[PDB]
Curated annotation (Swiss-Prot):
Principal cellular location given in the protein's record: secreted
Keyword Nucleotidyltransferase carried by entry: no
Name of this protein: Defensin-like protein
Gene3D superfamilies: Knottin, scorpion toxin-like
Subunit organization: Monomer.
GO biological process: defense response to bacterium; defense response to fungus; killing of cells of another organism
Length: 53
């Protein structure tokens, strides 16, 4: 949804740990769960979600 925003900056490199995204997602865009997802590059991108997915 609109609350879900994706920002690479650091490729799946960090997404290696579901705990990393949230950190960066929280420190970067201030997300809640910063969950990874698959984009056009089938890469895991930490998506900052500010809502109730």
């Amino acid at each position: 949804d609109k609350c879900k925003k994706v920002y690479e900056n650091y490729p799946v490199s960090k997404c290696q740990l579901a705990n990393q995204c949230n950190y960066d997602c929280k420190l970067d865009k201030h997300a809640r769960s910063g969950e990874c997802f698959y984009d056009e590059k089938r890469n895991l991108q930490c998506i900052c979600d500010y809502c109730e997915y």
